[model samples]
Target: DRICTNCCAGTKGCKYFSDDGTFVCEGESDPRNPKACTLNCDPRIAYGVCPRS
Candidate 1:
C-alpha cells in the first residue's frame, strides 16, 4: 500500500509567510521560522500563516 504524503517543515520550494512578517523565500525551507511549510502556496492551505506556540 502507498502512504499519504503532505508538507511538514523545512524543504525546498516550501515557503510560508512569517508571523514576524518575514516572508523570505529560499531554495530550501526554514523550520526555524516555524511558518515555512513544505508545500506549494495556496490560499486554502493553512501553514502560509504563522502558528502560535
Candidate 2:
C-alpha cells in the first residue's frame, strides 16, 4: 500500500514533489485497496472480495 500524496513521507521523500515538503500521489495505496490492520480496504476493488453484508 502507498501513502497519500499529501502525507509526510511522500512530501519529504517523494520524487513527484518539487520541494522537500511537496508530495503527490505515490500511487502506492490504491484508494480502492488501502493497507489496513486487518487488510480490510475501506473501499472494494474491482471484484475484490469483502466481508459479506
Candidate 3:
C-alpha cells in the first residue's frame, strides 16, 4: 500500500502518479468518491483517496 503525502485537492490538475505513468485520480472513473472522488473531502476540496484497498 502507499500513501499520498498530499491529496490531489481538486487543484483542477490533480495528478497522482502511478507506476510507469502519471495517473490522475480524476475521478477513479468520475467517481473515485472516497468522498470527493479524490478525497473524503467536502464541497470540492481534495484530501486525496487511495486506490489501495
Candidate 4:
C-alpha cells in the first residue's frame, strides 16, 4: 500500500489544489488500497480486475 504523501502535482505537499481550492484530490489518507475502496485511479492497474459490474 502506497500513500500519496508527496503530492502537489508531483511536488511535495499535502494536497492537490485547483482553481483556488475549488478542486482538490486530497492525498491526506493513509496508504490505502484503491481496490478495497472500489476506486480505480489508474486504468492500467485496474486492467487486471476492472469492469467489476
Candidate that scores best on TM-score: 1
lDDT of 2 by residue, 6-43 (tens): 32222212234333343333324344444333333322
In candidate 2, stretches whose alpha carbon ends up further than 4 angstroms from where it belongs are 1-25, 36-53
**Candidate 3: stretches off by over 4 Å:** 1-10, 27-53
> Which ranges in model 4 have alpha carbons more than 4 Å from their true place?
1-13, 28-53
Instruction: Kindly provide the TM-score of model 3 when superposed on the true structure, using C-alpha atoms.
Output: 0.21
Best by lDDT: 1
How far out, in Å, is residue 15 in model 2? 8.0
Error of 1 at 39 (Å): 20
Worst 10-residue lDDT window, candidate 4:
42-51
Give lDDT tens digits, candidate 3, residues 1-53: 23433333443334444444545454333334443334333323223434455
lDDT of 4 by residue, 1-53 (tens): 63322222122223444433332444433444332232334221211211236
Error of 1 at 40 (Å): 24
- List the candidates ranked by lDDT, beginning with the highest: 1, 3, 4, 2
Output the TM-score of candidate 2. 0.20
Over the stretch 1-43, how does candidate 1's per-residue lDDT look in tens digits?
2212223443445445444565544225444565644444433
> What RMSD value applies to candidate 4?
13.9
Error of 4 at 47 (Å): 28
Question: Worst 10-residue stretch by lDDT in candidate 1?
Answer: 1-10
lDDT of each: 0.41, 0.31, 0.39, 0.31
Model 2 alpha-carbon miss at residue 5, Å: 7.6
